[PDB]
Structure 1
Amino acid sequence: DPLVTTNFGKIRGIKKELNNEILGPVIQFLGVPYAAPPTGEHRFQPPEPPSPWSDIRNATQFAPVCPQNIIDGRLPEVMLPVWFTNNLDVVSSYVQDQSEDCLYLNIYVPTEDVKRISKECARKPGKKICRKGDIRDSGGPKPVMVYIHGGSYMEGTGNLYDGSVLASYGNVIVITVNYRLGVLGFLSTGDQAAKGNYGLLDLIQALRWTSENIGFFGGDPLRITVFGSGAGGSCVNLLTLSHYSEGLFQRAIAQSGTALSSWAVSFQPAKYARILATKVGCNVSDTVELVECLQKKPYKELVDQDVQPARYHIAFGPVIDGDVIPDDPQILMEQGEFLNYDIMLGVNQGEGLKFVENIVDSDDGVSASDFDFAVSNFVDNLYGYPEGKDVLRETIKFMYTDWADRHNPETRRKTLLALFTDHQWVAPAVATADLHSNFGSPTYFYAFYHHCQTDQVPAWADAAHGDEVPYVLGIPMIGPTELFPCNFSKNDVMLSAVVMTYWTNFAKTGDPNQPVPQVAWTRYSQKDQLYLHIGLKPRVKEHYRANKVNLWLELVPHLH
């Protein structure tokens, strides 16, 4: 009987029992409408608040997901979580139900049977405490954790991430959000015709609703924590930079995703807006006419298009618009032009598994020649062509040749994988933790070393990109799922508990160590660059990959 009356009308949740000795029940409000449909006249427009209902709508089933095209090959594996790629047939089922009217939330609320006050009132209704009281049986507003799913801004759905275990483990309310993706959510003609960042503006509208309504479910609109991974980790960072985020959240976690990578912002929104129009017969001279017709076209025709960008970049995604995103994220962060939030950033040992998992052989090595080509492919796709081709290629190659073991192609495999890891993930993440520390935001940093290798993951591989997700979400707590089908061990269960303790402790206190105790994860500052090495043997260590992070931050920008 879980009825809750929000500002917009009553909604009915569905109680969900959990299948683990420990964890207790969770009432989950699925498909909750946080914004009015961005359909028709409202396509390519910021989200409006939802229309109030006077009935009782069943928030018990998943609402449709935002329009996306899921096809092997036509999506960039080098970018999406490794659990996401290797298991697409499982991801299809979450996304087969589709609509443009897709702006929805899932709310995961932990429920105890402990009757704190209701039983005193059953004995004595007369006292003010009950006579006109506000304290509930589960008294004390619970910290809110909003997860922003991030693939490549083209696909995905919060519905993929079951917050139940993470909710009823840290006694927090976990929320998962649907926001506009693909073209629908990020098309920009580079002006006022289409301003881009619609998806972002959805997330902001989500946080508006949540900050206005979570109180009813028993949430604390002052202890809200946005967290994300992959591109959702980028959204987390892009939101800390957005003026639109004042008062809407207070603490942020970004997992293997910064606003600084070459694929977090679309730097040519108009180039790709107009290429798409060409594919649907809408490439007209004036932009507003071009967007005019794009609104008349059925979303499916738009989402079905093959709009490939250059490698490790995006075609549709967040744009620097001087509104939602005020300036270039590098400028905004070098000058410290951001409000203060408790941050917790982090990266995995081998994010860039999918950057090598093609040229690695049966004895799992990479040839001297295979290596030289891969860096050349890397340089020419990411840093362009002329200006300083040779001086850049030769430097990177030198810095990614382990010289204590130069000839063995197995360790040559590792470093090649490190190149893409360091460059796309560690460099920007360590840069962000640096620039947040300086301007007095409590910063915390982690490395992720422990994976759960399946039967699709090559044995040699360490923790892949995204591999950290199940532990954050407490999947090992309820056994293997169809989405994360790894045989989680006792050791995997222990770690997944430990990550969750921090991840909630942070949402509770903004300090991963307190209150729930477990090696104390010390704070991070540019001074000693202190990070927690999360794995089977956890340590707080210093200066993560310091000599490689700075190669890219300091030396390389001088080499053009």
Structure 2
Amino acid sequence: DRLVVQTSSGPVRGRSVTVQGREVHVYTGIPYAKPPVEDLRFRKPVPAEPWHGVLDATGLSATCVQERYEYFPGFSGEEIWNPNTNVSEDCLYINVWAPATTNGLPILIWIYGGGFMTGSATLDIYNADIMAAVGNVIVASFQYRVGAFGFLHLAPEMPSEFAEEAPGNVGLWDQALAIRWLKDNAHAFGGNPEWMTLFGESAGSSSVNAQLMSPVTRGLVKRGMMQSGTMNAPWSHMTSEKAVEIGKALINDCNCNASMLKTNPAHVMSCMRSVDAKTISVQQWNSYSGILSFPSAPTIDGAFLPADPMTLMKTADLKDYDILMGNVRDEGTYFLLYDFIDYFDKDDATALPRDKYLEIMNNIFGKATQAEREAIIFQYTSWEGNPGYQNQQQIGRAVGDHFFTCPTNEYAQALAERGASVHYYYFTHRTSTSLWGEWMGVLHGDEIEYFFGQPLNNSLQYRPVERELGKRMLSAVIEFAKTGNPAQDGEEWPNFSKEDPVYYIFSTDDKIEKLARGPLAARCSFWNDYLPKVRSW
């Protein structure tokens, strides 16, 4: 057939599409690992059984076990981020979009986010049809295990004989295996195995970070785009000891005596591999404590993550790395709405009084020193405008600043200091069809559509300015993947460094200056320079 490709594991046939005047061959649902079920739950992935007879790659694959967000039942803005194929443990599958230096096309690999608890490669928003066609590049995506299925970490609690029972981070190992699979099969799809770029958003972005710097994988890919997600962010890493405690609570929460873990490991694990996945998928959420602190995250395990995400870069030198990273204007509004939904409304702004500003701020930063609490609270007191709507606005900035934008800023400075070629963007456009309330502004994840080039899709409703910005943001990705540099020629987009922290504003207003330094530096110097000093007694 004109649509069978001969992979390292066997023959597979996809389907052919015609996007933007270009034929692309779309192969979805290719297995890259054995179905991680039965005794293979919680364990590292193992390469898939070679097959005979061409495998049907025209359907969407299953999504990894996870729970549906139903905070706004029916409301579509929430459900477009829920699974759109059935959930299953049998979920380790790859997708490749392949068009119709000399030795093959570039290959871009997407890693979705969703807080290491949720997410899926099959969401329409991640369709790489347009990107491949207009970019004339190869794009791939894949499911990786999320929640306790990917991050149950119990090894310290057992004898060393049982180390591989639940080592942790196996969702990172999934990505590693899927990435290795693509490098092995790049040439078979028309791709140049040495021309690969990772890109992802939120947790996917943090995973890109992890795949680039892990000792297990360091060297295979040196070119990556991290949208709103870096491993130094608080939600993106977790101690061994915390994971063990969260882990054994899930054990107790599924009625396997976690007290027995130390003396009879084999028995407790057998119990955990007997529980219906739906039960794990629910009870893991008991250990959800406060905002943006999920019970699953990349764990310091002395294996995939040998140390803390700020002791990684003491050492290594990144002369060969090309990095594109950035943020959106209102990273935190979405999370603030969800974790304080008693106060807030997805449609209307909330005039929040002073006492309840203190009550909410003191909640979010309740684990910081009160002298930090006091300093954050003063750094975000309003004095101009109508004070009610501004209080809510300022809590949103505080959330987004502390948890996303300024962790990104800091890592960007760290990378450029060790020699990487870093380019920084800031996404400020509020999509004209956004179904969320106006006060929530430019939402976390709002920029994904644009980098994927969905505004080129004439069947989707977008303003002509929006189509233009979509064309421009997609070309940033393609040019970066192609040359390591997002900048068009005749476009100034200089390198980002601590010495010169310039960033490119992605926006639909053409009256603004699109190169800027000051504003992000002022917001983040609070978090990255000043607040470290008040912690010192």
Unaligned runs of at least 5 residues, structure 1: 78-83, 112-134, 482-486
Match of 1:167 in 2: 132
Secondary structure, in 3 states, of the residue corresponding to 2:312? helix
Residue type matched to 2:90 in 1? D
**Residues 342, 441 of structure 1: 8 Å contact kept:** yes
Residue type matched to 1:539 in 2? K
Establish whether residue 475 from structure 1 lines up as the match of residue 464 from structure 2. Answer: no
Establish whether residue 249 from structure 1 lines up as the match of residue 238 from structure 2. Answer: no
**Cα distance, 1:518 vs. partner?**
7.3
Establish whether residue 233 from structure 1 lines up as the match of residue 223 from structure 2. Answer: no
**Residues 317, 418 of structure 2: 8 Å contact kept:** no
TM-score by length of 1: 0.85
Match of 2:530 in 1: 555
Q: Give the whole-Å Cα distance in 2 for the aligned partners of 1:181 and 1:94.
A: 16
Deviation by residue 1:290-319 (Cα, 9 ceiling, x = unmatched) = 333212333333223243322121212221
Q: Give the whole-Å Cα distance in 1 for the aligned partners of 2:246 and 2:299.
A: 12
Unaligned runs of at least 5 residues, structure 2: 157-162
**Residues 334, 435 of structure 1: 8 Å contact kept:** no
Match of 2:410 in 1: 431
**Residues 241, 326 of structure 1: 8 Å contact kept:** no
Q: Give the whole-Å Cα distance in 2 for the aligned partners of 1:203 and 1:316.
A: 16
Secondary structure, in 3 states, of the residue corresponding to 1:87? helix
**Cα distance, 1:393 vs. partner?**
2.2
Establish whether residue 302 from structure 1 lines up as the match of residue 318 from structure 2. Answer: no
Secondary structure, in 3 states, of the residue corresponding to 1:25? strand
* Residues 23 and 473 of structure 1: CA distance in aligned 2, closer, same or farther (over 3 Å): farther
Aligned-pair identity (%): 28
**Residues 145, 172 of structure 1: 8 Å contact kept:** yes
Residue type matched to 2:3 in 1? P
**Cα distance, 1:434 vs. partner?**
0.3
Q: Give the whole-Å Cα distance in 1 for the aligned partners of 2:453 and 2:319.
A: 31
Q: Give the whole-Å Cα distance in 1 for the aligned partners of 2:482 and 2:230.
A: 23
Residue type matched to 2:516 in 1? K
Match of 2:110 in 1: 147
Match of 1:276 in 2: 250
Establish whether residue 331 from structure 1 lines up as the match of residue 305 from structure 2. Answer: no
**Cα distance, 1:363 vs. partner?**
6.2
**Cα distance, 1:238 vs. partner?**
1.7
Match of 2:397 in 1: 418
Deviation by residue 1:4-58 (Cα, 9 ceiling, x = unmatched) = 111111110111233xxx4423210000112222222222222111211121111
**Cα distance, 1:553 vs. partner?**
1.4
**Residues 68, 83 of structure 2: 8 Å contact kept:** no
Deviation by residue 1:345-396 (Cα, 9 ceiling, x = unmatched) = 101111111244454685653322232222111211xx34xxx31x222211
**Residues 341, 441 of structure 1: 8 Å contact kept:** yes
Q: Give the whole-Å Cα distance in 2 for the aligned partners of 1:190 and 1:331.
A: 23
* Residues 85 and 52 of structure 1: CA distance in aligned 2, closer, same or farther (over 3 Å): farther
TM-score by length of 2: 0.89
Residue type matched to 2:528 in 1? L
**Cα distance, 1:534 vs. partner?**
1.1
Matching residue within 502, 516, 526 for 1:541: 516
Match of 2:357 in 1: 371
Residue type matched to 2:356 in 1? D
Q: Give the whole-Å Cα distance in 2 for the aligned partners of 1:37 and 1:356.
A: 37
Q: Give the whole-Å Cα distance in 2 for the aligned partners of 1:450 and 1:321.
A: 39
Match of 1:107 in 2: 96
Matching residue within 25, 42, 45 for 2:43: 45
Residue type matched to 2:530 in 1? L
**Number of positions where the alignment pairs a residue of Structure 1 with one of Structure 2:** 507
User: Where do 1:133-212 residues align within 5 Å?
Assistant: 141-160=104-123, 161-191=126-156, 192=163, 193-212=165-184
**Cα distance, 1:523 vs. partner?**
1.1
Q: Give the whole-Å Cα distance in 2 for the aligned partners of 1:468 and 1:373.
A: 32
Secondary structure, in 3 states, of the residue corresponding to 1:244? coil
User: Where do 1:334-349 residues align within 5 Å?
Assistant: 334-336=314-316, 340-349=320-329
Match of 2:160 in 1: none
Deviation by residue 1:246-294 (Cα, 9 ceiling, x = unmatched) = 3422211111111112211233111111111112111332253333321
